[PDB]
Design an enzyme around this catalytic site. Structure first.
Site, PDB file in Angstrom:
ATOM      1  N   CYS B  38       0.852  -1.151   0.000  1.00 24.13           N
ATOM      2  CA  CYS B  38       0.000   0.000   0.000  1.00 24.13           C
ATOM      3  C   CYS B  38       0.925   1.249   0.000  1.00 24.13           C
ATOM      4  CB  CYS B  38      -0.804   0.034   1.352  1.00 24.13           C
ATOM      5  SG  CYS B  38       0.236  -0.259   2.811  1.00 24.13           S
ATOM      6  N   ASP B  40       2.185   2.597   2.696  1.00 29.63           N
ATOM      7  CA  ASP B  40       2.162   3.405   3.907  1.00 29.63           C
ATOM      8  C   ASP B  40       3.435   3.280   4.702  1.00 29.63           C
ATOM      9  OD1 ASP B  40      -0.598   4.191   3.581  1.00 29.63           O
ATOM     10  OD2 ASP B  40      -1.266   2.272   4.196  1.00 29.63           O
ATOM     11  N   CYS B  63      -3.264   1.599   7.889  1.00 33.91           N
ATOM     12  CA  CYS B  63      -4.610   1.100   8.168  1.00 33.91           C
ATOM     13  C   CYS B  63      -4.833   0.829   9.661  1.00 33.91           C
ATOM     14  CB  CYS B  63      -4.789  -0.200   7.366  1.00 33.91           C
ATOM     15  SG  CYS B  63      -3.737  -1.550   7.896  1.00 33.91           S
ATOM     16  N   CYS B 107       1.089  -5.479   7.720  1.00 32.00           N
ATOM     17  CA  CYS B 107       0.786  -4.219   8.370  1.00 32.00           C
ATOM     18  C   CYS B 107       1.130  -4.299   9.883  1.00 32.00           C
ATOM     19  CB  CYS B 107      -0.705  -3.931   8.265  1.00 32.00           C
ATOM     20  SG  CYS B 107      -1.278  -3.865   6.510  1.00 32.00           S
TER      21      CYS B 107
END
Ligand code: FES
Ligand code: FES
Lengths: 127, 127
Positions: B38, B40, B63, B107
């Protein structure tokens, strides 16, 4: 640097203190849209009175850009007629989103697509 | 359903009310790790006194699973010696994370990898 991207004050405000997070139990309309890349889901719940949005809530476990955009879109939808809310898209908060990393354009589209879905859910229940 | 996944109460608590969000100005150690899927970025900031974590903050626009795991990992790191904090990984909060969608395992690893990076940054400045 060239092609610079990053996060603006307004997105940081709406990610840190999002408006309208939650769920409506037994909602009049419910919409959910997912993001194909990360698999996060945006859910919008609406209560409709007088053909208008009487209450709206969103729920997601997605990223900061999706949460800030949902905060801004649900705040703009509250109190609008169903036809006006159907016209809302992230274009309406373009200036707050300008500059974000390019992959977050899809994350920014979840809120309005879920709102449109919730409105269509409510309308299809009218009939 | 088979292979069911979703979000537990403990992750929802740490995503809605994360501990230690922020930045330390002029930190003793700074670590940043990104998620390849993603894009991030997780950033951890530490202040070190007495070879121990005297203060810790994280900043991310990723997230809910990354934010909840950082909240839990930074809370567990606070006050620990540098060698103990180096041993911390998301394994230490495995039960809270069990069940999450499988893509959020990456994540969940950002927080401890950024903490390890911040500790190594501080140590390399000692020398
Ligand atoms: S990375 Fe999943 S909603 Fe943006
Ligand atoms: S989807 Fe980007 S940190 Fe989880």
């Amino acid at each position: 640097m060239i092609q610079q991207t990053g996060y603006s004050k307004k997105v940081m405000e709406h990610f840190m203190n999002p408006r309208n997070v939650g769920v409506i139990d037994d909602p009049d309309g419910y919409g959910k849209v997912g993001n194909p890349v990360c698999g996060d889901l945006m859910e919008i719940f609406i209560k409709v009175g007088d053909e208008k949005i009487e209450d709206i809530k969103f729920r997601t476990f997605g990223c900061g850009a999706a949460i800030a955009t949902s905060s801004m879109i649900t705040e703009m939808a509250r109190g609008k007629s169903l036809e006006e809310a159907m016209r809302i898209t992230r274009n309406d908060v373009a200036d707050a989103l300008d500059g974000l990393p390019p992959q977050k354009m899809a994350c920014s589209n979840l809120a309005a697509d879920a709102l449109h879905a919730a409105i269509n859910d409510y309308l299809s229940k009218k009939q």
